[PDB]
Amino acid sequence: VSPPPPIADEPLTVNTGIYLIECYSLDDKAETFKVNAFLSLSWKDRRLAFDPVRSGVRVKTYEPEAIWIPAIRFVNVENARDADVVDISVSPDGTVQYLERFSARVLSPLDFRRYPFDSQTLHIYLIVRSVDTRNIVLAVDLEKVGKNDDVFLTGWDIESFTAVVKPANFALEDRLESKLDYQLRISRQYFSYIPNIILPMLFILFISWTAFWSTSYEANVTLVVSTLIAHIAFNILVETNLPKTPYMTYTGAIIFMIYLFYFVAVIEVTVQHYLKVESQPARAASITRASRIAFPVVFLLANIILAFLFF
Amino acid sequence: VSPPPPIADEPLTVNTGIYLIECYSLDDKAETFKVNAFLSLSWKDRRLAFDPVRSGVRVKTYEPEAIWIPAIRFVNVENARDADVVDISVSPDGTVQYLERFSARVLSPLDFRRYPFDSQTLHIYLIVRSVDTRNIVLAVDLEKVGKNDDVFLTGWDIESFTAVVKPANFALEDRLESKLDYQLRISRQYFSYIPNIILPMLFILFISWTAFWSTSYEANVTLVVSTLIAHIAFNILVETNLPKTPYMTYTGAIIFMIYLFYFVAVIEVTVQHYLKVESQPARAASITRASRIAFPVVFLLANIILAFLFF
Amino acid sequence: VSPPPPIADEPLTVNTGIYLIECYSLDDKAETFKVNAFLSLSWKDRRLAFDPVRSGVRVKTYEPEAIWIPAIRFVNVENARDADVVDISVSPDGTVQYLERFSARVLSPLDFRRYPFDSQTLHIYLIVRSVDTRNIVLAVDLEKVGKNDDVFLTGWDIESFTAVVKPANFALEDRLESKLDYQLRISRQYFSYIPNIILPMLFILFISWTAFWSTSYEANVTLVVSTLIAHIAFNILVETNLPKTPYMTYTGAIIFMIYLFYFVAVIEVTVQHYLKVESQPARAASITRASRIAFPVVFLLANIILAFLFF
Amino acid sequence: VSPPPPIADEPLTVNTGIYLIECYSLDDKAETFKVNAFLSLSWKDRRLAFDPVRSGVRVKTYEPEAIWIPAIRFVNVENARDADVVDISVSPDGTVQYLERFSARVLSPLDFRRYPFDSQTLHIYLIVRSVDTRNIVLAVDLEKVGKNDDVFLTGWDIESFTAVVKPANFALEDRLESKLDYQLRISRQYFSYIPNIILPMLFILFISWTAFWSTSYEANVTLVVSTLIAHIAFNILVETNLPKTPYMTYTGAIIFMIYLFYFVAVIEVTVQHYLKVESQPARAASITRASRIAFPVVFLLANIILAFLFF
Amino acid sequence: VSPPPPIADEPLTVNTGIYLIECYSLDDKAETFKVNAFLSLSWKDRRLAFDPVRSGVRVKTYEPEAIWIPAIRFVNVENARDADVVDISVSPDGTVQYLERFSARVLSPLDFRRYPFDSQTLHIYLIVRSVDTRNIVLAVDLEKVGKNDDVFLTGWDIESFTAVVKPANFALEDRLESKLDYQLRISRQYFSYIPNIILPMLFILFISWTAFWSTSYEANVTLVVSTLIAHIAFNILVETNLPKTPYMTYTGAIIFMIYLFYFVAVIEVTVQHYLKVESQPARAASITRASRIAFPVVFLLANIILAFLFF
Ligand SMILES: [Cl-]
Ligand SMILES: [Cl-]
Ligand SMILES: [Cl-]
Ligand SMILES: [Cl-]
Ligand SMILES: [Cl-]
Ligand SMILES: [Cl-]
Ligand SMILES: [Cl-]
Ligand code: NA
Ligand code: NA
Ligand code: NA
Ligand code: NA
Ligand code: NA
Ligand code: NA
């Protein structure tokens, strides 16, 4: 079966629509998401036109094999989508209404800069390759773009699912290609990061600062070194949930900066002990008293600077 | 093959039934479960009606290809179900009895608010889309809804498997969809959480309180910081078995609250040492004696408040 | 193609056999095992009778599509088995000898009560559903039940592979169903648990008891708290190799009980320090001396009681 | 299509060959390896004989469906191999030269006794099942056994890939079976185990022996208990890379033995403290001085005994 | 269908091209990467030649089944590629233009010597096998070799994707093979290794050197042993992201060398205590003062030597 011939030299418009049934498995490390959706395609094929008065029938149903169907592919999928043709309906003028239900694993890059207070625009790119006989162009039927009310993505809030109505028409290997951009806007639910990572991380940090109200070097060494080890555990935990980025993430910056606080607390604990052993506890007392204010003040100002730079 | 034509303008009723053979892999992080079951479908097709006397047969067996079969899909499935047609039997009046055995990975959301003492209602949503020629509506044959007595779900107790007999009829892309809700009620076997997480977590916490019967700052720092690190290990362990939720879970709240107890125990240990170094051990003795009562009492009252709020 | 017709009203006997080629992946958490085996089926189909003089062949070979083959399924599989038809041989009377090689992931519940000194009876349930025309019943050809001498299951000893010769015939959705029970008896190789979990766990426990020969509170706190943390690591390790059970496992009980020993050792260490600080070391000396005997004696008696209760 | 008929009562010889293209994924825990290779089969079928000067062609190419091909299977595969028929060439005398490219996951047992200084013999067992018309026997065409020079197996050295030319002919379910043993000899690259596990493990052990040059019980307890915990971490790490064995492996024995050294170091540290508290430091000094030598000596002697027993 | 016959005895040239659409999953441990691309093939088949004037058409479209297509395979793939034929266009002279979109998991070795500052040359080896009728040779159409500008490989920078235009011609299984080398040059984004592994690792190391400004053996033991344990955690973390190599990696060498620094710091801490207990603190003071300079100087020089040897 060949493509429909043009009336004049016009390209063949394939109107498209995606209706999300299910959203699942947003993998941060992989930068992938799985989707289960309806893909709708519509185009005119005058060769299929019929008289509804004569035929008695208002609509003609077809098997995919029986007619020409545009080969629509997804640009950003891991493997080709698993599709099930739901319906193919032809109206008297030859307008074909194709509907399939598919499942696909989509590769869409994520920006982790503001993690875990980040928002993402996930993409589903539809594409058609033109033939020698005629140029095929994609379009968006907005009446056929949407999502089921029950669509949920664990650990995320779904903001909107829209399509950039204007396709990207470009040449690729001496044939036209017509690409469409379906955008699924999501924002991470940061809630659980507060009681599970952020506040536990701050508690252990504040515990290390109790060494500024202690003259016991042995206890101080234990306080600062022990809490530093728990910070390393949190750093390891955080970096397991994320891919390696050529930029600093928000949490990454805080986590990194906190190492400097532990390092300076050790220097302080060391300086205090050395002075007290050298029979200079008055000087050690001044440094320890200043530290009590300096450490929380510098921590709060540093966080204000970071929050400003990232948001 | 076209759908059965209506006698009058009535929709076609497809009676359904699901009989669970196997239940497995309830994944909490994924919020999925795997099922292996019988799907039964029944509808009247008068074009298939026959005279038992002339034919000799009192039931006719068919191959799926030979006749029209309604395209039934599951809404909440990762990938389309793996089905195997077991039987298709037609009675003289044209009533078709279709049976298939399927396996599917079902996506059903879980409420972790009362974890690990939670109960869930897992869903299997059956759907059918109408055709241009006629509207298809779903029904429940209760005689064909059930589960094998041996059906077990590791870590869970199976309470019931029932169906909401009235479908949720709605329009989707200008065609009627008829959706049925099959509900599998389960309750989590919380038993193992008691010897493996809850009691070890309480033991380490109570160990931190032995610092209220010690004047040794160095030993106290060791007691409270060491047990805090073991609590972080339990928090990490717990959060690996669960997805990130935009709400507090029962265990999550207890785990979080216990951090405040460790924090205040460190403040106490610090205050006691500072006072004793300042030659004020009488005042330190009063704070330590009060702590011995205050810590267990406040812990027990806080847990009563939490248990009340969650149950 | 219809099933073979009866000579009289007798059901159709399908003789079965399973010959294990490979056993692998016994997953404790999943309660599954993977099997690669021969499935042999035999039944009479008089419609397939032939004269070897005419046909010029004593046995006829067929493609599965060419003839009626009973639809044999496995009850307890995750997904439908991967099968490859090896041979189909028809002798002149119409006796069909079907042979397939399959691989399947079998769901079979495990009893961890005596873990890791436990034994299991793994099951492979064969089933057939009757048709309108005639009742199909399963049987066991014992000459065709067995296992390759080289069949090994990593971490287990294979005791026997037998079949319960009498099928379970029962009605399911108004049709007879014929079930067969193939039983693979295995027993766990508990060896590696001794040098990797049990003995390391006892060594750290005995190390904590050296605190009963020390008057150094700071050293004692370190001894008991440090070894308790290593016990938590072993508990976490053990529970990762097992599913969450609504009962106590043997190892689980020992692991749990050992927490009580660590808890009481902390109480002792605390009591000893409090007394020595209160200038009562004579009383502390009595408690410490008693502990030296009490702790190992109570540990040994408690283990005798547990071993008795579990075996 | 039936098998080739015999000239006399001789069995049909199927000459075989395996040429490895890729080797990957040697999974120690699973005791599996993945292979991508050429499988070559050759046999005479006189029914396919032709006159080259009358047919014009010197060699005839066929589609698998067109001719009888022996059903060759692999004994030790997880799931049936993924095969792609590359070529089928028939020479004038009726000699068929079949070539396929396959990929398979091979289940082959491993001997961890000398790990990580172990060598293995991986197996790929080829098998054919005879038919009623004639017995099929396997043979090895050595000219068609080999491996690509670039074949690498990460973490292993590939020594040789040979075939035991004599097949194992045996009856199985009243038909002859002809098995062939293809052997892939490999030896593990132990190198990385030295800087990552062995030397770090020895460093921490030698660190624990610095307690033999210290009279500080509190410091000694810290030295020995801390390093013991790091040894537990290495033991856990090692046992994650290996399956559970009903025998001791080399690393396992060393790892186990080192626990006894930590245990005795604790006894020593305890004995030294008890004596010094009892005002017997002269006796404690003798035990500590003896320990300084006895420990490394016994350690190094015990290692010689182990190396001897294992190699 | 047979291959195209030669005009004279010339081989059949199959011009090839690969256009990368997506690059993903560079697995370091597996030494694999997943690719989604266009594979273009072109060859002359005079049997397909047509007169454009009498045919009406300037080009002819074909279904793969209708014509002879060269069987092109990939050498270094795990499983055979998943392909979807996009277009087959025949020009009047019989020149066939074949286009398929494929996805494959390519096995390509990585050199981790300079890790994580390493660069790789990933390979895709295209191959075709000759037939008895004629020799098939591969060529590169450079106009059809490329990559989409949006092609990203998480954690890597893509430098170039080129082809070695001259094929490798060798005999394998008594037929000539024509192999092409497609090279994807990448360089690892080392950025995240600095804040997550390298700097944390240096901070803990420098913390252990504060023991050179302390006379407290108990505190020193804590400082050096605690930080050593955190170094073991980083070593374990690093080795989980990498396969076992028969060579030292850059990070591996640094990580290994740092163990020697911890070992010598323990010797120093021990020597200092022994001397001070023996009433020789003046000598201990000299060793501690020298260590303060020696340790950072030797660390910096050792790193200069290592950086030189590796880069
Ligand atoms: Cl697609
Ligand atoms: Cl479905
Ligand atoms: Cl509606
Ligand atoms: Cl409708
Ligand atoms: Cl099955
Ligand atoms: Cl196979
Ligand atoms: Cl391929
Ligand atoms: Na079509
Ligand atoms: Na149908
Ligand atoms: Na300590
Ligand atoms: Na059949
Ligand atoms: Na064949
Ligand atoms: Na072809």
Numbering used by the authors:
A (entry chain E), B (entry chain A), C (entry chain B), D (entry chain C), E (entry chain D): 5 to 315
From the study:
At present, the best structurally characterized pLGIC is the G. violaceus ligand-gated ion channel (GLIC), of prokaryotic origin. Each subunit consists of an extracellular domain (ECD), predominantly in a β-sandwich fold, and a transmembrane domain (TMD) composed of four helices, labeled M1–M4. However, the GLIC is a pH-gated channel, activated by lowering the pH, with a maximal activation at pH 4 and a pH50 around 5. We instead found that proton activation is a complex multiple loci mechanism, with the key contribution stemming from the coupling interface between the extracellular and transmembrane domain, with E35 acting as a key proton-sensing residue.
The mutants D49N, E75A, D97N, D136N, and D136A display small increases in pH50, but do not meet the criterion for a significant effect. A structural analysis was performed on E26Q, E26A, E35Q, E35A, E67A, E75A, E82Q, E82A, D86A, D88N, D88A, H127N, E181A, and H277Q mutants, by solving their structure at pH 4. All structures were in the apparently open conformation. There are no significant differences, measured as 5-fold over Wt, seen in the backbone Cα residues of any of the resolved structures, with the exception of E35A and E82Q. Additionally, the prediction identified E35, E75, and E243 as gain-of-function locations if mutated, whereas E75 and E243, when mutated, have either no effect or the opposite effect.
